[PDB]
Point group: C2
Chain length 135, copies 2
């Protein structure tokens, strides 16, 4: 339903939310009834707003960049690179003060012109290794 | 330039290579000059054939399933689940005899009607955890 240019605009807002640590960008790309796949995350867009706030506090010099975008029908696939310096706990890893850079791929479902749900993979093994949690 | 149904057919061959432990299926979906992103892997399709042979010998009941497929132009995105029981060395982990089931997402580049390159992420952390290595 969304044209490709429109999906590109959604992605610009998604990236800006993280890079600027400004959750308001999410209002322009995420569904208010967003369904995070982790049930520990709050239902709706508040769950993703909480993620923005967490990253803003635990990562310095955060950078999220778009390596590739693939769009078909109600699906958008974003391959991205996520980097920064760890200054707070990240996914069970105590604050190391170290740089990291890892890849991820998110697949978004589009509903009502917004991302409503995702499935993802991130190089968490690489993240653990870079942040000194694993040899 | 591949019709979408044609990409689905490529994926059926890709899945069958793993599920049947038969590298010949790769001849019907991978470019002979395949470019694996890992420089440690042999150049061309033999790098991927080697992967089939390895997984087929180290995993019992190997199952590779296609959970979602997104196709646009010369790109095919396959979200998959990789399951089985470890019966040989996997990534330096000695044979544990344990079950595993982990997700991956592969993005394939299509050249000359075949997959010629990929970018991917796979839940290797989860695989290590499930096999008792971490």
């Amino acid at each position: 339903e969304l044209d490709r240019a429109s999906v590109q605009q959604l992605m610009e807002h998604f990236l800006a939310a993280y890079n600027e640590g400004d959750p308001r960008h999410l209002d322009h790309c995420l569904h208010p009834e967003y369904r995070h796949p982790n049930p520990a995350v709050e239902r709706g867009i508040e769950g993703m707003r909480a993620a923005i706030r967490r990253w803003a506090s635990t990562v310095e010099d955060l950078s999220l960049t778009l390596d590739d975008l693939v769009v078909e029908g109600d699906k958008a696939v974003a391959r991205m690179t996520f980097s920064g310096r760890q200054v707070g706990p990240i996914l069970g890893i105590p604050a190391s003060g170290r740089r990291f850079s890892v890849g991820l791929i998110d697949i978004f479902l589009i509903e009502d012109g917004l991302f409503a749900q995702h499935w993802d993979e991130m190089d968490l093994l690489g993240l653990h290794r870079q942040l000194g949690a694993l040899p």
